[PDB]
Design a protein around this nucleic acid. Sequence first.
RNA 1: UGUACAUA
Length: 337
Amino acid sequence: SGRSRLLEDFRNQRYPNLQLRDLANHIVEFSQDQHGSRFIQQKLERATAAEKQMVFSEILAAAYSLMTDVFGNYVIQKFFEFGTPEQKNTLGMQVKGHVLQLALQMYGCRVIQKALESISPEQQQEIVHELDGHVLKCVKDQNGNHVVQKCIECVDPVALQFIINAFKGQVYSLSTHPYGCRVIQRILEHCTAEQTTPILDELHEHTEQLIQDQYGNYVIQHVLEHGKQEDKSILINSVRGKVLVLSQHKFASNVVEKCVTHATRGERTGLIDEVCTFNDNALHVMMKDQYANYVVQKMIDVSEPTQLKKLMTKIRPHMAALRKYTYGKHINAKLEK
RNA sequence: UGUACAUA
């Protein structure tokens, strides 16, 4: 069966001045339609509390089905953003008992995220309690991980301890997971020092593997860009002596750049001198490499003058030849700009 | 000249 006459006429531009009240008895049908849903979304704000209640009445009967609908989920979200406190509370009761199922659903997870941004701390903690015992399942889920991230962003850290507890012994597995690595970073941004300490401790049991992992390299870079000095120095200690090799790696080259950027003055001198203070060809190998040439350029940018002079002494003899090299030519281009 | 992060 197909679209009602009213919906089809609306879609064919037959009612260019249509209003919400004209949709009586067809609100759910419009909400399940791409264009009908956009119409409701656009009209809900600027509408009168009386208009919203007729809309709210019809969706409420079908609230759960709309939360998981490709087009209806936006209408539910619109009531979390523009509804009265009572409407928001009534929607919370429709979510109650279904948080996990919605969090794992590709459209339901959008409703849960919007709710978390839109409701009181008390109402947030009702939602979070339903994820206790299902943390790892949600974190490793393509929809659920976004709900867990949003909880960490928006909810009092005290109520998040169950996530920290569930992550014990799982930090390497999650930091190397396409979805888990996102949640680890949210934890490092938003959780308390007592919560991040066991995460960081466990992280540091796996530094060398994480640095060269497809997803773990982002977690390591996060700590270098945002973490405490003590943790940055631990990380830098897994890179010293390894600059040449790691700079040639697609993933780890980015870690090397963050090490030289966020190091202390002395650590940065140590890492840069490793590849230019000895009489070896490390810097030349790096300049010609598809990834390490970016590391050389970063070292040029962050080097204090003493180290810049040392780099330039290694570079200058190769300048004329570098212009023909696929990646090396970018060193010459930088220095000739 | 270089890697993740989702709806019409």
